[PDB]
Design a binder for this molecule. Sequence first.
Ligand SMILES: O=P(O)(O)OC[C@H]1O[C@H](O)[C@H](O)[C@@H]1O
Ligand SMILES: O=P(O)(O)OC[C@H]1O[C@H](O)[C@H](O)[C@@H]1O
Ligand SMILES: Nc1ncnc2[nH]cnc12
Ligand SMILES: Nc1ncnc2[nH]cnc12
Ligand SMILES: [Mg+2]
Lengths: 237, 231
Amino acid sequence: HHMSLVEVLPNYFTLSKDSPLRKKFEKVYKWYSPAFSPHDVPRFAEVGNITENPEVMRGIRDFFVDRYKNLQQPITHILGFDSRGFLLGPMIAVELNVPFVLIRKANKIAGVIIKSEPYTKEYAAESEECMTVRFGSFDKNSRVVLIDDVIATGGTMLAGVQLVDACGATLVEVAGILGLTFLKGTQPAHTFAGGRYSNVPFVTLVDETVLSDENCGDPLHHKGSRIISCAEAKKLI
Amino acid sequence: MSLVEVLPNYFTLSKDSPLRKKFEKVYKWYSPAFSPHDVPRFAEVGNITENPEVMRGIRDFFVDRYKNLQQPITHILGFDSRGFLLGPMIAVELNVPFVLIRKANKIAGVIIKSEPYTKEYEECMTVRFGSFDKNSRVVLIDDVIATGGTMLAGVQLVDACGATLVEVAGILGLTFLKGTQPAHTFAGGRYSNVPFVTLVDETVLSDENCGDPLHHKGSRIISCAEAKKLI
Ligand SMILES: O=P(O)(O)OC[C@H]1O[C@H](O)[C@H](O)[C@@H]1O
Ligand SMILES: O=P(O)(O)OC[C@H]1O[C@H](O)[C@H](O)[C@@H]1O
Ligand SMILES: Nc1ncnc2[nH]cnc12
Ligand SMILES: Nc1ncnc2[nH]cnc12
Ligand SMILES: [Mg+2]
């Protein structure tokens, strides 16, 4: 059940074009235009169509569990980003028998917490929002994987790298299910702190080629706002 | 393990359940000075997710409960953001969709929005139209059930599609808040026969599993530069 990666940019890996798991993603991943999306990027890849497909979810789980089980030196923690990284990390961490550590927006986490620098995303300019992690959840002897759903500009991953760096831990790999390689999202993590993390592979199972013209999820016709009330929805039962 | 009905249709693990005993050792609570929310005892979910044995116990309990049914469950619906930590690992083992119930401006497509809701500490939940339908048999899942306002928002969305609500599931039920009441009184009591099942309850929060750092000086939020001086 092994699936194969190809290095498409330096330390940016994605599944081969012919990979059976990629073909499964191609049938389920849909993108939405600004008219039907919470953020007006050209093609918004809704994670719910992935979580609604248990076969693809199992393929994601199996890929990363097998990958990290077969390392010569095991990982000790998986760190996942609020909110969509939360959907992917725990099912991997439970099979590896490692902690799943939450990286959360402001302060959401109780106790003593470490805050990143203010982050940016493909669709978010810098503001006061930072990512945080619980102090004491991992340390300088930890070997960690950062996981999210999408890697676009790499701003979110940079915030995670800053938090890993704040504890002196070893960053083994950055993991996701969709990498928009034309945005070169490896760059922030790979140039932070004078290149301290340039040897960290990014592994995103599929890439922008999954967001094909035939994979638009927009309704072909829809009355009014995409946001409907419960009473309006009941008339469609 | 075995469940005890502590309030009408509000079930939790027995006092001697081995899984309850594991929760007792792992769960920590935080006072308002060390928590993001103004409640006496805030039960941080990160201490659960950091313990793979307890996560496996949670997953195995619900997978075992919901498998091999005469009428199978068709979908697990989980709440943004902490329900997202629990639902997928169960759904993958049951081989069913996990459906996101999300806060505003989070799901793409045509979406159904609930009435405004409140929590223990305006704002509405949403679900993608077409993720489930009147023939679905669904479980709602979250980490904590407190006032039940969040669960009521989920019930409204399930009701909006005519689906069968099979069960309400969580890991921590604060029974003194009687969180069954919003869901069980909605629409004239239409869902009053739906059990709430929360693995543990407020008795898991004792004097001895308080997580407050009793010696920490200054702000509980530290910068990366400050954290590195502690390495
Ligand atoms: O930071 P970027 O790489 O630009 O964008 C990816 C992030 O933005 C969205 O919240 C995704 O779920 C990821 O957390
Ligand atoms: O709505 P309540 O039952 O009062 O509070 C429970 C919710 O409040 C917190 O976000 C928890 O994660 C649940 O989603
Ligand atoms: N294009 C995109 N689609 C979905 N989630 C994203 N997060 C950042 N960019 C995204
Ligand atoms: N006391 C509490 N602890 C953790 N999460 C909660 N959500 C609502 N009430 C809560
Ligand atoms: Mg968000």
